[PDB]
Amino acid sequence: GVQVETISPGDGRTFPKRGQTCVVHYTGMLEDGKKFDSSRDRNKPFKFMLGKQEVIRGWEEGVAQMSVGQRAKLTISPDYAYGATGHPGIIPPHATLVFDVELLKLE
Ligand SMILES: C=CC[C@@H]1/C=C(\C)C[C@H](C)C[C@H](OC)[C@H]2O[C@@](O)(C(=O)C(=O)N3CCCC[C@H]3C(=O)O[C@H](/C(C)=C/[C@@H]3CC[C@@H](O)[C@H](OC)C3)[C@H](C)[C@@H](O)C/C1=N/NC(C)=O)[C@H](C)C[C@@H]2OC
């Protein structure tokens, strides 16, 4: 449902743990490589917690594997993203997504 391909390594030691908030930057693209969203465009890190349905499942399972400082490409099947529906005006139906995600820090 999610493949993780590292772009730049993290420290390999500091992973998200229960009660912590992940602070990330991301860019989301479709399979054709075209961007549909990026926190870097608005220069606003995205904060979320694991275990609360705060993100699509591909992020839930992918970012949980990342360590602080890591930049990774997450390739997410529709089951782990927006499935047959998509997201109105942004993501088409049945869309495999590619996110470039950087774990900036844990809070
Ligand atoms: C009150 C709600 C506002 C609230 C919005 C924010 C905290 C802002 C946050 C940065 C999201 C971005 O705002 C510019 C947008 O980012 C994307 O462009 C993106 O790149 C993108 O894919 N993501 C953003 C970065 C993480 C991975 C992923 C993600 O998981 O996004 C959450 C989301 C829409 C989950 C669905 C939720 C329902 C559930 O059933 C579905 O299961 C199939 C999944 C999103 C964090 C959600 O949990 C919280 C919200 N939702 N608003 C909604 C749904 O309208 C997606 C396509 C759309 C997002 O705007 C809604």
* CA distance linking residue 71 with residue 84, whole number of Å: 28
Q: Tally Cβ neighbours within 10 Å of residue 86.
A: 15
Amino acid at residue number 17: K
Amino acid at residue number 31: E
Q: Whose CA is nearest to atom 6 of ligand 1?
A: 46
> 3-state class of 61 per DSSP?
helix
* CA distance linking residue 102 with residue 26, whole number of Å: 6
Task: Give the position of tokens 């990342």.
Answer: 66
Q: Which of 35, 56, 66, 75 most suits a substitution to test ligand 1, by most atoms within 8 Å of the C-beta?
A: 56
Instruction: Name the resolution in angstroms.
Output: 1.7
- Ramachandran region, residue 12 (left: φ > 0; alpha: ψ -120 to 50; beta: rest): left
Look up residue 32 and give its two tokens. Answer: 């054709």
Task: Give residue 3's domain range.
Answer: 1-107
Show the DSSP H helices in 5-93 as ranges.
Answer: 57-63
Domain count, the chain: 1
Cα-to-centroid distance, 44 and ligand 1 (Å): 14
Name the residue among 47, 64, 90 with its Cα closest to residue 1: 64
Q: Which residues contact 50 (CB under 8 A, 6 or more apart)?
A: 16, 18, 22, 60, 63, 64
Contact criterion met (CB below 8 Å) for 3 and 59:
no
